[PDB]
Structures are given as structure tokens and as C-alpha cells.
Design a protein around this nucleic acid. Structure first.
Lengths: 72, 97, 85, 43, 60
RNA sequence: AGAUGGUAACAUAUAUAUAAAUGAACUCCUUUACAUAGGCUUUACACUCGGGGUGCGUUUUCUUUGCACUUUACCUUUAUAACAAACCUUGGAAUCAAUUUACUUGGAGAAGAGGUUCGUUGAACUCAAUUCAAAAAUUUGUUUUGUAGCAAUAGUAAUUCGUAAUUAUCCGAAGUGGUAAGGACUAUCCUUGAAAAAAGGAGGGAACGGCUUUGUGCUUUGCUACUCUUAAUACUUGUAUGAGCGUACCAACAACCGCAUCAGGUCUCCAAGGUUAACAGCCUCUGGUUAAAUAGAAAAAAGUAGGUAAGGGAAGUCGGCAAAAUAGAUCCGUAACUUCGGGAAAAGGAUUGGCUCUGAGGACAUUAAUGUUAACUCAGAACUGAAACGGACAAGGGGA
RNA sequence: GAGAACUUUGAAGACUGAAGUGGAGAAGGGUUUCUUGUCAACUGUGAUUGAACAAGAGUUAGCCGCUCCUAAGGGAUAGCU
RNA sequence: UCUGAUGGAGGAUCGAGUUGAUACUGACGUGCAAAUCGUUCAUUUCAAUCACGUUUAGGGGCGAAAGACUAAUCGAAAAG
């Protein structure tokens, strides 16, 4: 498992052919924070989003033919 | 900080009163290891269906459950009653099963 | 304070073995555990490592010597005769 | 033991197989029988 | 008769064999249970319980 | 035709992925790779204390109460942080200084100051990202978020709902030192405490672009955008991932060996609480058991395993055989003899409980003075009791 | 259950007392393991129990081991007897 | 020279465990047992203890030496 913080690196990894699935995790903190995890052949890359607006925008902009799995 | 213990169900069954409960909490909460110095810092208010304890010092919510169990044990009620947490700030009297 | 009147380092042996044997072993353990002058660095920090090997804690350099002392009279005499020429 | 050689394990299986009783239908027309605790097969 | 159920219940509830309790009456259903699944189901419905650990207070 | 920073110790490739930093023959090293003893120290696990939450229990009386749960793996060169060391730069030391529990170290360069690396560990440290202010054709201070990713989706403890689902918690601090490992050391040896497979580093500098062409791999003419490294795909290659074997159970209490379901023997690891020096003894929690080639009743002799016995105290007996006698700890005192080390726990005295107190022994910040907070360890004094207190357990008889 | 001191369940009184009849393994054993039946003999008393008897079933690895290396050492080759 | 600390040596001491086996000449002696049980006792940083592997084979081995041990067999094993 690898955590990545750069949004451009995240999208660049997502667009790659190896990537198959994106995992969406949402949970209440104290506000709901989320974690987006691309599943590649080598590693599983997660980025943590504190806000909801940016997380939704990234999820929508995410390439759609790769399958989505929501854990909650 | 306000703690609420409801007794709506038991007193609707009329198996228990509110005046006795409230009096018990008045003379039994011990602050500074003393049983009758609630004064300004800790107060207990009144309600026809619930009981409210307002606290301004370090306090443990488990004390209310302890005292309620004490009361229902003294009045031979504890065999049918349980104190269950409702939310972050409230207890509630519930029957078995 | 002074711990032993005369037994010295042989106090580890207690009363066992003869007094003469303990005194004789003391005489040479004294010089077996002593520090010697490292003629290469000039610091008195040469200690016995094994039965005939002496290492300088500073030089890290080791030298063949006697069993219980860095040098033996028979060896120093021979070296003196050799260097005379 | 738990760790065994292949040949030893096959021998154990064979010795277990030879411990079964005579078939009933054949009895319509055994003595070389052993118990794991009484007689050790030593092999 | 209920040795199998005791073993399975201990394994399922992750406690000792001596810490499981069958309902003294209504043991026919317990005997009918012969799998981890069934023992889980009828523990959830309350025919086996896990007896509380013996109290070892530290107040003294 | 083979990159770059730092004075240096040394560092740098973060591509999905730190993959590539030319390098032959021939060499030289390193790792693998090693004893014992002693203490000091760090970390993890263990244990424990207090707070918050949840559930249960006691509740004649007392009890802000007693108990349980409150978790987080490998992997990410895990990044960083911190620390023992070693090294580099500067520095230039006697009024010697730094420093350890201990000793260790220095003009062959110490202290101080600033750095580098390895090793311990593995989210420490604002660690990362983010909000807000101050530096410029990207740096420093201030918030939020996240158990750093794994990760909560899993576990655990609860409350509900047809009978499979919902919900809430999973966080604020510390102490003891038991086990294990690591580190830096010191000491011991007429004892110096394996090897190889395998892997790495270096020294050295053999070979050298591409397209076309003359002549017999070489000289040559005309042009330049090319060599390595990782990944993917396609085709060819015989079918272009991961062979075979062990894996149940006992390990003694009836699964082993003693002719047996035999009180025998039989190797290793984990190791809770109380009392305590203690992994002793005794009692207890988790786990396990309540079974032993038998039961019931009676209860005399005798046997066997123990107890206790007035007065005397070895008269017993081959012989004090057996048993008894204190026996812990603290304080005091300790002879002959001696190889000077011992003898020695010589001998021989006193004290010891409980309770209520008193004194001593540390760490952390502010403008010489004031607050916050921890460990059990010693010493002393009152009071108290059927004069008893190492109350059980445990535990020298001495001497000539 | 025909039959219960020694099969099972619940309650109680106790024990083992983390140097444990607690968990993992090695040697040795070899199916004793599991489930379902079951009692002729055995389980030195009983027995409906069982490590007995009967029928079925059960052991899944690129990462745990062997396999590889070398040690004390063994065998063998060349010779030579 | 003397005193107080520090330090942690020793085929040093006590002592569980481990390894043994002093005494009761206890029990048992048709035993639980062809050597056991109980209490007592010796031993615990070293000439220490254990396991596995390996070497030495019978007029031979091995022996801190008892004619000990060499698979319940030893002043010459066991098998034919």
C-alpha cells in the first residue's frame, strides 16, 4: 500500500492501463472525510481527502471505464 | 454540561415515581466526598417525565447509572429494570428482553 | 582503603593452592596484566591479547612478545647483539 | 512423526489398508490383523 | 452427547470449554446442532452462553 | 566513448517502478562469520495506576463502587524524529580538560561550534497535505485534516430491527522492571572460541557511433540526430511462471520405550496476580480438571505416613539411628589458629505486628525568589494488643 | 438407556496454580484424528463410555520445512597391498 | 602507610531448577517399578548440564581406574 498526496500524480496513475478499480471510502471524522484508492497491479495507492467538494470533483473527473467499488 | 435520565416508560407504567428519584439524587450525589454540598456547581433540575443533572465540575456519567441502580435495588425494582445509554448525554430505563 | 595486606591480585584465589604457588603466580600475573610502552606511538597502552601477542590500544598495532611480558631478556639480548654489528 | 518420507508414508498407508476385515460376501464361502497399540509394525 | 457441541461452542465463542453454558432444559435442539453455523445461530438466539470470567478484584 | 553536487565526512536517478552513473582479462578485500563474564543503557512485549465511554455485578448497611472491553499485523529503500557510536570541517588544549555506573580519551589534535554516516527502532517529530502572514523572476512562522498508507471495510464490547440489516465506542495521560533483542563498553584465557554455498565492493583499463561506398576486419569518400535501462505488446522459439515430498493426531495425563491403559524414563519454546529477594513455598485469574485396576459401611488389633505428651533429658543404643532444637531480615559482637586470603552465618546477644505520624533521598519555568509532579526505600516517635508479630509458608544446630 | 458412583447437561464444593494433566514442536508411534453407529471380547468394579469394534471421511504451500552449502565425518575413484 | 567509596574477580558461598544418590540400613520387597516411592542429602560459571550428529567393535573398544561400561548380558558381549 502506498499513499500519494499529489493530485496530478493521482490522476496520472489513474489514467494508466494497469489500473483496474477505484475504491471509495467515506467516513465521519468528528464532516465526512474520504479516501480514494486506485488498485494497480503493483500497489494500491490511496489519497485522503478532508473536504467533500474536491473529493466529488476528482471522483467525477475520474476515468469511467475503470470500475468503482464503494466500501460503505 | 447537562445529563438527562429519562423515566418515561417506567413512570408511564407507574412502577416508579419521579419525586423519590429526584430527592435521592439530591441527597446522594457526593461532591468532594461529601453527600450534601451540591450547591451552585452541581444542580439537579425537575421534569415530570425526565431527570436533569447540570454539572460544572469533572463528573462521570456512570455515576447516574450507579445511583439509579441503587434506587431500583432499594425499591425491589432492579429485577425488571435496566439503565441503558440513549445518546452521548442520556440514560434510559428499559425493561428486560 | 587498602583491601589486602599482601595477597594482592591473588585474592581471587582465596585460600586454595599453596602460599608459595600463589605468590609465584602473583609475581608474573602482575606483569602479564600490566600496560607496556608502545614504541610506535609512545603511549603506554600495550596490553596482552593472547599468550604471546601484544596489542596497542592506540596504534591498533600488535607485536609478538613474551608469554607474560612484552619483552624477554633473552630476546632483547639477542637483538642487542644483532644490532651491534 | 509429522515429518515423513514418501516411501515410509506409502508403507503406512499400505499397512492401514491391510488391516481391514474380510468382506462379508466373501465370508459366505482374518488372522493377519494388528492393532496400533499392541503390535508395532517396526517398519 | 453434547461434547461435540461444547467443543464447537468453545471454538466459536473463543473461550474455554469450561466457560460455555448450555441451557439445562431444551438440550434436544443443542444436540441437533452439529456445525459451527448452527451453534452460532442458536448461541445468538441464546441457548449457549459464555459464563462470565470468575471475578478477581484488585481492591485489596 | 561512459552524469553530477559537497572543503570534507559523503550525497544524488522517487520513472506506476530510485531501472540505467561504460567497463574485459587478471588480482585484493568485505559480508556470510561466530567464546565467556559483568554491569550500564534503549526499544518492543508483559504487568500495573489514574481519567473518559460502554456493559455487567454488589447494594440489610457502605461504596462517585468491583469487574470486562476500549485492538491495529506484514509491507511502503516506510519517510522522518530521537539516541549510543564512528568520521569530517572549524577550533588549538596545564590552572589540564571532556567524561562513565565502571574507565575511557586527547598536539598521532581535546573541549566548544557546525556537520556526515551506520546501526537501533518504525508515524516518533507538525510527519504529510491544507488555511492564514513574512521572503522573489520559490523560503519562514499560524490552523485544519489523518489512528501516515495498510485501517476499519477488519476485530472487540454494546443497543436495536423481519430473522440478515442498523446504530454508537474503540482516546487523555503515567508507573514497575519481568522477559527478549540491540548498543556502547570493561574484563578472562598456557582456553582466543567452524567452514562453504551465496552476495557485494574495489584495483586495472581489453572493446567501441550510425547510413552508403573504394580497395585486401582494415584506409577511403557523401550525411547525421544515436547508445544504454525499465515496462508493455506482437511474432518466432517444443507448451515462455512458481517442481517434488512432508502437513491428520499423541507427544505421555492411557497414543513413545519399559511384555500393559506400568506412580519409571524421555529433548525444546511461551510463562499472569498476591506475599516475597525469588520463575521458591502457599493461595488465586486465563486455560485445564474434578480422573486415576472399584465403591459403600464400620472403624477394633496390627501395619504404614504423621501429630502431641507431665517430670527427667541420651540413663536408650554398637553408634543420638530417628526426631527435636533457630533457621528470614536489621543492629551489635565474634576466639584459637592461619598459607594473612580466611576461620565467620564463628561463638553469642537484641529487635520484628497493626495504626497515627515525623524526617531524608528526585524531575520539570519564570523573572536571587514562586509553582507542578513521581518511585518505594531507609530512619525515628507516639499509641495499641491476653508480651505477640520472619505469627502460616519458607528457613544453618553449635563448640572442643 | 434394559440397566448409570465412574456417559451427557445444569447447580455446588474443590483441584491443577503459568516450573500447569495449559498451549506449540522434535524423537518415537502410525490413523490412535473427525463424524455416524456400536458393545462379542477389551476398557483388572460398573459402563450406555473409549485410544475398543464397524462404515465412511479427513492432511491443500513459490513465502513453513526438506531439497542447496559446508562440519565432525562416511563412501568411492587413482594407485598400492 | 591509614580511612571511605567505587569496582565486580574467583574451578568463591547459600540455594530452587537440573544432574545425582548420603541416611532412614524408612516404605515396597507375590512391588507402581527385574531398582520404584517418601523424607533427608550432594550439585548449580564450570574439569558444568542436555540434545542431535559422528568416531572407536569383542582377546577388541572405552575407562578422572570400580575388573567399570560396551542394548536388564562382561575377570572376555550377543548371534549362528
Amino acid at each position: 500500500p502506498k499513499q500519494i498526496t499529489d493530485i496530478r500524480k493521482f490522476l496520472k496513475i489513474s489514467r494508466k492501463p494497469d489500473t483496474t478499480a477505484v475504491i471509495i471510502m467515506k467516513k465521519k471524522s468528528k464532516t465526512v472525510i474520504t479516501k480514494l484508492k486506485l488498485r494497480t497491479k503493483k500497489y494500491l495507492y490511496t489519497m485522503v481527502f478532508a473536504d467533500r467538494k474536491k473529493a466529488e470533483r476528482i471522483e467525477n473527473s475520474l476515468l469511467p471505464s475503470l470500475k468503482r467499488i464503494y466500501y460503505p | 454540561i447537562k445529563y438527562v435520565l429519562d423515566c418515561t416508560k417506567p413512570v408511564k407504567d407507574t412502577i416508579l415515581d419521579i419525586s423519590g428519584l429526584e430527592q435521592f439524587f439530591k441527597d446522594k450525589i457526593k461532591v468532594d466526598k461529601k453527600t450534601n454540598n451540591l450547591k451552585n456547581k452541581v444542580v439537579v433540575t425537575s421534569d415530570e417525565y425526565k431527570i436533569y443533572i447540570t454539572v460544572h465540575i469533572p463528573f462521570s456519567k456512570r455515576y447516574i447509572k450507579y445511583l439509579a441502580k441503587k434506587y431500583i435495588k432499594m425499591h425491589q425494582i432492579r429485577d425488571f429494570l435496566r439503565v441503558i445509554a440513549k445518546g452521548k448525554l442520556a440514560y434510559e430505563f428499559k425493561y428486560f428482553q | 582503603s587498602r583491601r589486602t595486606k599482601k595477597v594482592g591480585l591473588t585474592g581471587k584465589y582465596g585460600t586454595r593452592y599453596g602460599s608459595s604457588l600463589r605468590k609465584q603466580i602473583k609475581k608474573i600475573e602482575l606483569m602479564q596484566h600490566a600496560k607496556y610502552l608502545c614504541t610506535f606511538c609512545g603511549k603506554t597502552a600495550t596490553k596482552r591479547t593472547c599468550v604471546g601477542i601484544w596489542k596497542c590500544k592506540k596504534c591498533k598495532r600488535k607485536v609478538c612478545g613474551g608469554a607474560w611480558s612484552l619483552t624477554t631478556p633473552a630476546a632483547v639480548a639477542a637483538k642487542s647483539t644483532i644490532i651491534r654489528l | 512423526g509429522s515429518i515423513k518420507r514418501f516411501r515410509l508414508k506409502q508403507r503406512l498407508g499400505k499397512c492401514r489398508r491391510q488391516n481391514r476385515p474380510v468382506p462379508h460376501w466373501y465370508r459366505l464361502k482374518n488372522t493377519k490383523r494388528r492393532h496400533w497399540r499392541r503390535t508395532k509394525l517396526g517398519l | 452427547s453434547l461434547t461435540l457441541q461444547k467443543r464447537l461452542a468453545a471454538s466459536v465463542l473463543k473461550c474455554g470449554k469450561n466457560k460455555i453454558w448450555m441451557d439445562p432444559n431444551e438440550i434436544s435442539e443443542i444436540s441437533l446442532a452439529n456445525s459451527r453455523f448452527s451453534i452460532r445461530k442458536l448461541y445468538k438466539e441464546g441457548l449457549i452462553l459464555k459464563k462470565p470470567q470468575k471475578v478477581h478484584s484488585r481492591a485489596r
